[PDB]
């Protein structure tokens, strides 16, 4: 990356640029750009400028057509397979045929026949992004599959689906029976009446993804009775969640052959993630279900479940025994199997899974991911939210730090209460009591208090306000972005 080192009040800074790799640069100064940088990258010349000095999450936006539901990483191509589904919508063909139908009905008024307003109506397609989307209908939908290169903004492939078909799942994988050929499975639904809920059926499209992830060609379209909203590769085969039924599917030349099935899941399958051996199912309402797949019989056995109902939105496996899950109501939990759980067995299940973490974020989380944000740092549980916000959950390395930040939380709860009369502990215990989380957003407000309060709180912890502030910065230095260059 291109990093900028500059001194600031006898204190250096080495902040990287939110930009692609560059090959050369030199200082620039013109009337168009008084203070800029001329940088050459691979086969391109760029006149740039560094106006803002603060480091934030900067973006480059690739416009889409419909609302995206999920995308998957193709390992070889490093490209994206995105499904874009929208309620109350028309497909492009329906927009054309309906627009034209209106054009035909325009002439039937028999007005002196001599007026061609259709020549001005069929000509101009108003920009759908600014003038709103011309979309309506209660059973109508619009879903599109797209192959996009993440490096540039170009779209590699585009597949427009039928009128009332709505894709909710997608995956990219290979099958054991076939060679090293990459397949793209897309779960679709037909005639969705959302309220009240009623479905006609579902489909599963299979694609060959030839040209190292550049084109999709139609293999087959296997039908099914209920909407499949969960697709996951599992031991050379694909686990598909259709309704409340979790099925093991293999690839066939004519259709996706059903190899196994389980129908004891409570309500409806929203998501599924699997370690190499186990299967973690996300019920729409009844939290997580642990399912083992017996290799000898192709028999899915439920060997554990949760003691609390959870309207799950997303999840991620932290290890072989713990799952971190998000909530429709804006909560996050971590559930761990007890170490004595027997995998091979045959109010819901016998052995239950204990919830080791509860924490109300306040904004509905739709993506959890355990990853390292910067080179050299440690893994963090980065989550995104429905309000366009990015957060992290961070483990403590020693009990001394846990007690420290915990006492900071207790102090700031009384000395720096929330601004709108809310109780902090009650707010974070919205639906479930807080279990093993310290609100760092509250803790970092230590810097905003009056100096006498910083002195009282710090002296209560046998420290000084600068020491508290630095110890709060250490978390960001370890797990987040810190560009302080001594």
């Amino acid at each position: 990356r291109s990093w900028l080192s500059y001194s600031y009040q006898s204190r250096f800074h080495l902040t990287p640029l939110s930009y692609e790799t560059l090959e050369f640069a030199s200082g620039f100064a013109s009337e168009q750009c008084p203070e800029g940088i001329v940088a050459i990258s691979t086969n391109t010349l760029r006149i740039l400028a560094l106006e803002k000095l603060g480091a934030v999450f900067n973006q480059v936006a690739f416009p889409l057509q419909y609302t995206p539901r999920k995308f998957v990483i193709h390992p070889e191509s490093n490209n994206l397979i995105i499904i874009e589904t929208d309620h109350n919508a028309y497909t492009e063909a329906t927009k054309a045929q309906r627009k034209q139908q209106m054009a035909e009905e325009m002439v039937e008024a028999a007005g002196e026949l001599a007026a061609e307003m259709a020549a001005a109506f069929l000509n101009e397609n108003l920009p759908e992004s600014i003038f709103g989307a011309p979309k309506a209908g209660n059973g109508q939908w619009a879903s599109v599959i797209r192959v996009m290169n993440p490096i540039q903004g170009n779209t590699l492939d585009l597949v427009q689906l039928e009128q009332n078909e709505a894709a909710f799942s997608v995956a990219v994988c290979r099958f054991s029976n076939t060679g090293e050929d990459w397949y793209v499975l897309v779960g679709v639904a037909k005639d969705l009446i959302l309220n009240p809920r009623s479905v006609a059926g579902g489909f599963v499209y299979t694609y060959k993804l030839v040209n190292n992830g550049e084109k999709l060609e139609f293999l087959h379209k296997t039908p099914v009775e209920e909407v499949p909203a969960a697709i996951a590769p599992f031991q050379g085969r694909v686990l598909i969640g259709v309704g409340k039924l979790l099925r093991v599917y293999d690839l066939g030349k004519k259709k996706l052959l059903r190899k196994c099935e389980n129908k004891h899941i409570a309500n409806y399958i929203s998501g599924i993630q699997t370690i190499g051996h186990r299967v973690i199912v996300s019920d729409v309402q009844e939290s997580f279900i642990w399912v083992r797949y017996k290799r000898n019989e192709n028999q899915l056995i439920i060997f554990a479940d949760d003691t609390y109902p959870r309207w799950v939105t997303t999840a991620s496996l932290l290890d072989y025994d713990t799952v971190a899950g998000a909530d429709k109501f804006g909560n996050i939990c971590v559930v761990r199997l007890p170490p004595n759980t027997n995998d091979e067995v045959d109010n819901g299940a016998s052995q239950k899974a204990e919830v080791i973490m509860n924490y109300h974020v306040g904004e509905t989380v739709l993506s959890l991911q355990k990853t390292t944000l910067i080179p050299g740092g440690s893994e963090s549980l980065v989550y995104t939210t429905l309000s366009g916000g990015i957060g992290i959950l961070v483990p403590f390395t020693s009990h001394e730090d846990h007690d420290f930040f915990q006492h900071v939380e207790m102090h700031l709860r009384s000395e720096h209460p929330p601004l709108c009369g809310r109780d902090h502990l009650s707010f974070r215990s919205y639906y479930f009591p807080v279990k093993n989380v310290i609100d760092g957003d509250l803790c970092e407000q230590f810097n905003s208090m009056e100096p006498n309060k910083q002195k009282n709180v710090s002296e209560e912890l046998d420290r000084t306000p600068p020491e508290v502030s630095k110890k709060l910065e250490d978390i960001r230095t370890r797990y987040a972005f810190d560009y302080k260059d001594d």
Partner: protein, 66 residues
């Protein structure tokens, strides 16, 4: 307890209970921003019209009683 709307007693019918929790649910949707966001994204309708239909479902939910 009796004067708090949503409170129950021994002769509370299932219809009263579920219209109670239904109205509670609709008002909770009105409150929590990201919930109304999830619902307004599921069905392609603006926040305003989703709130409006949630208000129309206040004397309507579970239909008429027995």
């Amino acid at each position: 307890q009796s004067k708090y709307i949503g409170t129950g007693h021994a002769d509370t019918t299932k219809w009263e209970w579920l219209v109670n929790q239904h109205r509670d649910s609709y008002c909770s949707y009105m409150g929590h921003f990201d919930l109304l966001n999830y619902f307004a994204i599921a069905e392609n309708e603006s926040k305003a019209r989703v709130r409006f239909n949630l208000m129309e479902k206040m004397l309507q939910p579970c239909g008429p009683p027995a």
